[PDB]
Design a protein around this nucleic acid. Sequence first.
RNA 1: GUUACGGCGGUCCAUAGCGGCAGGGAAACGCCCGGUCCCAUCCCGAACCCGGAAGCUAAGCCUGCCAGCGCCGAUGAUACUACCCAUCCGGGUGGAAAAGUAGGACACCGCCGAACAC
RNA 2: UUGCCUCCUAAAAUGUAACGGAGGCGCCCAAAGGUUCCCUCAACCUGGACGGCAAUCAGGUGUUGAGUGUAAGUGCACAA
RNA 3: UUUCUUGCCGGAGGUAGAGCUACUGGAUGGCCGAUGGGCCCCACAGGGUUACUGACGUCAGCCAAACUCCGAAUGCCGGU
Lengths: 192, 48, 79, 49, 136, 126
Amino acid sequence: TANIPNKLTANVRTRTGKGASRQARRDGKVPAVLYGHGTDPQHLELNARDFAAVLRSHGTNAILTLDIEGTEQLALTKALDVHPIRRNIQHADLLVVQRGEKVTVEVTVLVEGDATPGTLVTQDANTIEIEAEALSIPEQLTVSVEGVEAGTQITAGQISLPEGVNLISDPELLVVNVVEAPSAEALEEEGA
Amino acid sequence: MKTGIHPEYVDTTVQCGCGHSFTTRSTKQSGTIVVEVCSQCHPFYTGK
Amino acid sequence: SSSRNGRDSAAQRLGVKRFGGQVVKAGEILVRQRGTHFHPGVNVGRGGDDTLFALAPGAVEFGAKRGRKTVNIVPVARP
Amino acid sequence: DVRPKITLACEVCKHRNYITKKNRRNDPDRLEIKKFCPNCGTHQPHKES
Amino acid sequence: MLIPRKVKHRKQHHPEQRGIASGGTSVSFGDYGIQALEHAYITNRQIESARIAINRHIKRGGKVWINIFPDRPLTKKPAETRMGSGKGSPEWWVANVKPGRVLFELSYPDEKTARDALTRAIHKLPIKARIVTREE
Amino acid sequence: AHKPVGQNISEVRRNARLRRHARLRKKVAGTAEVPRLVVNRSARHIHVQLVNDLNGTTLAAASSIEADVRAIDGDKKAHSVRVGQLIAERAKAAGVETVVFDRGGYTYGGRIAALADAAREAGLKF
RNA sequence: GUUACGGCGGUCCAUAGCGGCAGGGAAACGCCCGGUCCCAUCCCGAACCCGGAAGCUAAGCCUGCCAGCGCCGAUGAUACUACCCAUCCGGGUGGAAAAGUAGGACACCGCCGAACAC
RNA sequence: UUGCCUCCUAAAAUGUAACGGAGGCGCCCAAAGGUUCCCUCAACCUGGACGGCAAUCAGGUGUUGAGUGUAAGUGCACAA
RNA sequence: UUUCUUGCCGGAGGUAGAGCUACUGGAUGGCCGAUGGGCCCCACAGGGUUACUGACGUCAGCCAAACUCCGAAUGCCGGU
Ligand SMILES: [Mg+2]
Ligand SMILES: [Mg+2]
Ligand SMILES: [Mg+2]
Ligand SMILES: [Mg+2]
Ligand SMILES: [Mg+2]
Ligand SMILES: [Mg+2]
Ligand SMILES: [Mg+2]
Ligand SMILES: [Mg+2]
Ligand SMILES: [Mg+2]
Ligand SMILES: [Mg+2]
Ligand SMILES: [Mg+2]
Ligand SMILES: [Mg+2]
Ligand SMILES: [Mg+2]
Ligand SMILES: [Mg+2]
Ligand SMILES: [Mg+2]
Ligand SMILES: [Mg+2]
Ligand SMILES: [Mg+2]
Ligand SMILES: [Mg+2]
Ligand SMILES: [Mg+2]
Ligand SMILES: [Mg+2]
Ligand SMILES: [Mg+2]
Ligand SMILES: [Mg+2]
Ligand SMILES: [Mg+2]
Ligand SMILES: [Mg+2]
Ligand SMILES: [Mg+2]
Ligand SMILES: [Mg+2]
Ligand SMILES: [Mg+2]
Ligand SMILES: [Mg+2]
Ligand SMILES: [Mg+2]
Ligand SMILES: [Mg+2]
Ligand SMILES: [Mg+2]
Ligand SMILES: [Mg+2]
Ligand SMILES: [Zn+2]
Ligand SMILES: [Zn+2]
């Protein structure tokens, strides 16, 4: 299941620094860096609005097609430095990638469906590491809860993992734990 | 092997009660022992 | 209504006394310290209270020798 | 005192050369040690006064 | 009340209350949380009131994580006394809060009730906070 | 496969010897004018080097594997005295009569003492 | 000069470590055999010390390959900061981390000796 | 409370105040001083009659978490 | 001119910040699961069942004037 890369435009940062980054961030642009086996850390401003839009559409983990001054590159979002408060993305890290390339990544895990009513489902690890190709990276994968029995644990090793993707996390990492819903005489008994 | 601090040690002749002869060395000042129950006498040793 | 503390001792003025590239006489003490934070280096001796001093004239210079910060005296050329 | 001041004198010239301390509880007898005598010129026994 | 079993030193200086929360700025245990916006001293009184507020509002089943601990003591010298004679005896406990730190976190099925319990807690705190969700 | 579990006496001998050598080395060293006479010793041979620690170089050396030394029908002390006189002659040729003795982490005595006293009488003052 | 060699060293002493898999015994390095002699055990010829060459690559030693653990580690951003603007907010110019990422690394350099055509 | 010593305050040289925050000292050891040589702990697992997690024995793992007369700090396994 | 300023060069720090599976303490929630808890067959042997309490460990998020695997800017010492 190939995911189509998203087409952004970028242009080489003329000069570097906190003043330059603050100014660029002020003009609705995100400073970022390309690296990888391209062996050239290349400093690129890109459109903040388009960056946020594509991150909304295809999560944190999505291939991009960068147009660097006409040259055409394939990139993959490695990290995003984001402000804790203003929540704007400050910086981005872009591994260079090509087809048929396995890469390690972290994919969010969103529990889906309703559970049995007497107990609450609670996730400890929201993200699971997987090894997968550049184009075949899943932006999210689901875990099944449909009327479980009494409280039991779920680990990464029993998830319906996609095709062409490989678990990296040790299979005994807990993801979602159904824990019995606290009674009336049990909910306010902890916390002091 | 110190000068004289260790106890006296000489070769000794050990004879079993059931007829076995042991040629050994011990601290016995005499150097002579006879034993009535030995490695060929006990029911556990020789199955008897 | 009273503080059960309020005592301290005199400051002993410890620390590095001659820094790198500084010309010293033979016998000048170079760093006062408690333990051996700086270990004696080449042509540098150590005193009774762990005071490092120079055993020859030259220029001070620090180094690291098998994970040990050391102080050495380097013979400057005679003009 | 239990660690009083004591003096050491050379036997062969009876000059008191050194003063030290020692524990009387642990060294009840006179302390004697081979010290250096400046006028005898050499090392001599020195005994407590 | 949340009180440390022992502190190595019982009379410290006032916690420096400047900067932005660098550590502890994400919601990880539950799905909704209360995330701070101002520097303050959140005492165990505030924390207990806020936790009881959340429990009263949801009242059925759901997990409340108090991922801040009041373990820093503020002292107070006895009343009617002049200045001097040394520092006082410690008599309340505090967490040092920076703008950015998620204070309380909640896990509960529905949305509106969870939000309302979180704002009920917020009203008991000496700061401005906001409700933050498990996703960017 | 038969995986061994213990430590061998070779390891303890080798590294304890090295530790003794280093403890010794904390206090002796070699210049150009007073070099260091370092010694190795095994069950078959004894080795000596004359070292200038300012460089990590060796000025003269000898062992009990040379033609003449293997030509001696005598005892290990005889090989030791031969090595001592040879290294003394080689040092004297190299232009040195003062040295410091690095006994190499072995206890001074036996064949090492024989070597050292042979060098002592042969012209090297230490 | 060649060396699946032996020593003595050096390096802001792990980019060198730990672990794993696969080899070697020319001389060497070892183990190994014994306690007649120097010397030795707070008892023990186990260690140390002295003599010997029956057996060995099983170790130690060294060689080659593995990045699993430990180690090293940018660029960029950020934190913090000097000075300066600035009516609180905040900003500009210089310096710039820690953590993390890309990755690196199964050390390198030197001087003597051994055997080998010499 | 008043002299001395150690740490934090003390803003990475030194120095720095308050009836600021914590403790020690007014000794001790004829070896616990000098030198020479030798060794490496604490803890943990396994195997052992008393003997129990725990006492001494043996095997292993163990680079410093033990110990350093005596407060604290700086040191020390190259060992102090 | 030794003074002072600016540029460059040679230094020693443990502050701001940060980090803590790098120590000393605090401290949130999970996970497995002891030892010690109770019970059955029935012995106080032994075995398993059970809100057990739940050592140790481990996952993730944190905190410190007297914590530090780390770690600046300035200032300071010298040279030029
Ligand atoms: Mg002081
Ligand atoms: Mg001294
Ligand atoms: Mg003194
Ligand atoms: Mg006595
Ligand atoms: Mg401050
Ligand atoms: Mg945070
Ligand atoms: Mg932090
Ligand atoms: Mg409010
Ligand atoms: Mg064994
Ligand atoms: Mg390593
Ligand atoms: Mg061979
Ligand atoms: Mg023998
Ligand atoms: Mg082999
Ligand atoms: Mg070997
Ligand atoms: Mg490291
Ligand atoms: Mg940088
Ligand atoms: Mg204003
Ligand atoms: Mg880093
Ligand atoms: Mg200072
Ligand atoms: Mg300062
Ligand atoms: Mg003042
Ligand atoms: Mg007092
Ligand atoms: Mg002593
Ligand atoms: Mg002595
Ligand atoms: Mg042991
Ligand atoms: Mg200048
Ligand atoms: Mg400079
Ligand atoms: Mg520095
Ligand atoms: Mg400090
Ligand atoms: Mg801080
Ligand atoms: Mg503490
Ligand atoms: Mg600090
Ligand atoms: Zn018999
Ligand atoms: Zn006299």
